[PDB]
Amino acid sequence: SMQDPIADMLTRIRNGQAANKAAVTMPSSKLKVAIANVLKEEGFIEDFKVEGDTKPELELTLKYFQGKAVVESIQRVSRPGLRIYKRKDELPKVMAGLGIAVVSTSKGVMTDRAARQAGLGGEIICYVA
Amino acid sequence: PEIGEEVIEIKAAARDPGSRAKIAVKTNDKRIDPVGACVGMRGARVQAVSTELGGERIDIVLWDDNPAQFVINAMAPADVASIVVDEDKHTMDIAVEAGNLAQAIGRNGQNVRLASQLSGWELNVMTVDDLQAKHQAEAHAAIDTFTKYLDIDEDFATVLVEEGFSTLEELAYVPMKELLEIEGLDEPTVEALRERAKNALATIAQAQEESL
Amino acid sequence: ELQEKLIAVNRVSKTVKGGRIFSFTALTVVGDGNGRVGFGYGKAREVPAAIQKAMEKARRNMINVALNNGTLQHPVKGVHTGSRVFMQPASEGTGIIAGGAMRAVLEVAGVHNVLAKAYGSTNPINVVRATIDGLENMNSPEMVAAKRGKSVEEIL
Amino acid sequence: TVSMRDMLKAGVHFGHQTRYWNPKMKPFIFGARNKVHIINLEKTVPMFNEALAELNKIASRKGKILFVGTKRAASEAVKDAALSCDQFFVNHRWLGGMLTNWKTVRQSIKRLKDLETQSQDGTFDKLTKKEALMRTRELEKLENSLGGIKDMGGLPDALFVIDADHEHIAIKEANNLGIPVFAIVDTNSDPDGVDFVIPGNDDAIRAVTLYLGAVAATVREGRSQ
Amino acid sequence: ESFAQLFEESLKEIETRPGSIVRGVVVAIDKDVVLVDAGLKSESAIPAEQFKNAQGELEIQVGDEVDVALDAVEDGFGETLLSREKAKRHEAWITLEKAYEDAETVTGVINGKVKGGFTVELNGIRAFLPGSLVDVRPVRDTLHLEGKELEFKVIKLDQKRNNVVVSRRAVIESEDPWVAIAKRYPEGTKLTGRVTNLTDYGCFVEIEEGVEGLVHVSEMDWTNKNIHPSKVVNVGDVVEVMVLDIDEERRRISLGLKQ
RNA sequence: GUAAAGCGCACGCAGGCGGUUUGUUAAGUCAGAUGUGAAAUCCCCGGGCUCAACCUGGGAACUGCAUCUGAUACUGGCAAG
RNA sequence: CGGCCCCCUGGACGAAGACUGACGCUCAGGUGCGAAAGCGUGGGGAGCAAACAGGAUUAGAUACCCUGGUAGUCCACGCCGUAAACGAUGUCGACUUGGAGGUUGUGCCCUUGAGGCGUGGCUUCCGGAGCUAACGCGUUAAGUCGACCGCCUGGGGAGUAC
């Protein structure tokens, strides 16, 4: 059964990048939306678009720089089987700071740097590079 | 042997036998490295030509692409930073610093001729400051010419030539929409001021009629 | 200017009607002490000829690597067939902490400071290939900025 | 330069069947007519123009062009095209490693040249018959194989090809060496190795001729420049 | 723009599948291959034997136009099924024209009954007939001057199997294959059938409304085993064959050619 | 899959995991504080034995536990969809 | 699991709608089904055939071959619980280029004809990216991921002893 929506998102994105798909669509969720927004802010994607009322569909638009994809790597870290929660000091650095780590915090979902700046940790969703 | 089996693209060989012999070479991007093959293990083959016909300062430059990269490569072995261009006689104006000019110029009558035939035309070694000096000696002149072009009032002309790049000398062929962004652009009049400059050119041709 | 290291040389056999024909394989690697690196794997009936071939091949099929000053830009993994390799940027003075073929390639590459372990197989050929792969994929800050449409200070 | 109507007349828009296509060509396909793929001329034309411009630029800097077609339908035409602009060509079977293994083939060229000289300039006749027949046969072989590229000297600076899938060996060689590739690529073909792809009917004779003629004209222009 | 889309549907509108629109201009002749271009993906490898008329020499130079046939695409490279079949549609149209006025008038010269019925030939092709049709009455053209010239007056046609029998004389006078498969049966009814594919043990001549015949390898000639059918007859040609044997059950009508 | 390693196949309790929206809670989670976490040991900056080991001042650390005050994105609970 | 028929009976798929409203996935223990051989009791017994007997072959022939031939194979009700019980590939879900078929639905289309254009289910082969020690797998993954379980830790001794 479908158990982890976010991870499914990330896999879809990965597969689109692999296959040189322009855009990747999937059912929408708020957490998914926020993640997409974070990615866009962090520039791994061009734009995201949710559409629909009863069952809305998130549609991300993937990014390709000099042929190859932008999202070099994208992994979940927290997962239903095994959750990961980090305190602000302990927060990670993806690719020695070049990549990002999406982290959900009390004040919303943000990149690891942003969280560090804020002064708070939380659940580590995914690394992106 | 790579050059012999068409692996080291060797165009011209602008070199002065009996002194310095610097020459650039191109190659089909395939992990070949042209200069490297010409040099060898610690200048293995380089030493051969060094003591071949006589003590010569042979040099190899990694040709990049087109003639623009040939300019810098012709200034080697030294440190080029920038260069000017033109039409038929572009005259590569070498732009380096006094400190690095000592080696770049090397000898008054040696590296100034060896690097002159490098591109096939001729080079004009200059200085970083020299470039700027001549650079400004050009902004004032599309203006530094008794202003024989458009002409209207002078108080507006100063404020227009402040923002104006390359004065107005034949600037109508450029973007005719960025001067309308200037604070003060009602009906097409500045787009008309440039037309006046065009008329001034015709007036200059009429002056040629006055002299021919 | 280029420096060249023969990593290994190995005798390999071919059985024929008469008996065993022996030959020699030479694994070399070359580099300019900067980003640029290339390995070559030559074969000949005699050893010196085989290493000569290895050098020739290495000199061609060279690859560039984006080095932050003496070390790497971030931890990087690279694999090839059995040899799976981890290598990690390190502070000036630490030197090349790496084993075997891997070491050699790093030195010619002109990296001076790394912490580096070869998991899995340590078959010199495969492990050097894996190293090269890890070095190639490694991107720089400017590169990622360009990829992503940002400035370097935005990425830090 | 080359108009769309002319291409349509030639039969460029036609492309291979629907069981023989390549999904990397899906962009370049427009539709499928009578279970036959149609190439999108709207997307073909601009790129063809581009490719022409690049070829012209190459010519301007005194670039060496190699014209490859071994389809044996358009071998005559490719040779004609090469000659019109006095460039080089391989209208018969491409020798495996012609470019990569140039140095060996260069000897081959030299032997061919020597044989030609013997035939023509020497005027020595008086050769043992069988031996003379053998030398003649060798000459014919070498002319067929390396006739166009004999005056080439080194390695070309660009590579025009009539079929990518058919000449994939040449393409691969060009890629290994880094020579620019200008390929006519039908729906069945693989354009990944190609630098300046050209979606067009490699098979049809008139279309091939048209492709060649425009290429030759732009080479001549660049030479004039 | 939609220029191209409109053109695509235009060019759809101005071609059809079968060999109907005489469009292919002969753009290269050499012996033994003619080639055309009917606005198809490729040029047809035409035989010379589709295009020589009734005495053995060619008739069309460069630029000449005949339609070919379609609905089969790309055996690996190329385009068509041959154009004489197109001529068969014109012959069918001429035969149908009879219906209008109840009399199709041509020349028809029927010397001898292949399979009971005199063979009647229209200009290039020769068709086979059922017995009654050669003669309106018991007149029997065996006493007429050999290969005589009258006309063809249609007595019988099979309407799915191209067997058409016509009346040469007497100007004044004016599932489906397998249930009733007893028409060409009795022992020896000969037929005019085009061969389709020679499978190295066979030839597969099969013409008579969706059946299959095999003249396989043993008869074919008057040599048994060293024969290799491709050498000895043809590809795609109408020949002498007769039944010799029928299965109505395991649908193997085993024709012969040594007759 | 072939190197050791997918139960012969199913159903299914306990257990593990759980679509989507809103509200609420605040258990998990995070932040801050307080209490404690003996001294010695380890590490940092110092000092004293001629140096060192050794001795030694101050810090840091002791990743934890308990409480109180917040945060509520996520996980959980409860209520409605 | 294979001749037809009838009776009782489980599942699958498609077509539209209508409803319920997360009721789901996985599963240690547990429970059930589980080829062939084998066991028990009672029936049956044509053919075949472990065992057995004879004839050959052979150095020997406790085999292969031949002639016979009993358990068994068949039925009923119990037990046994294992097989290279194999796709040597756990189950469920999602995503990622293609081609050629088979089978079984179903929508439209002049079925003008065996057809034309789609859209579902199951299924055979080839092959791309990717993966793989390679062989190969390749939208039915051995690719990219998530949930749960089972299992492995050098060869023998040993899947044996207690």
Swiss-Prot record, chain C:
Residues in S5 DRBM domain copies: 2-65
Mutagenesis or variant effect for R11L: In strain: SPCR9; spectinomycin resistant. Not a ram mutation
Gene Ontology BP annotations: cytoplasmic translation; maintenance of translational fidelity; response to antibiotic; ribosomal small subunit assembly; translation
Coiled coil regions in record: none
Keyword RNA-binding: yes
Note from the entry: Altered uS5 proteins have been identified in a number of mutants. Some mutations in uS5 have been shown to increase translational error frequencies. Some mutants in this protein can partially suppress an alanyl-tRNA synthetase mutant.
Family: Belongs to the universal ribosomal protein uS5 family.
Name of the protein: Small ribosomal subunit protein uS5
Native source species: Escherichia coli (strain K12)
Gene behind the chain: rpsE
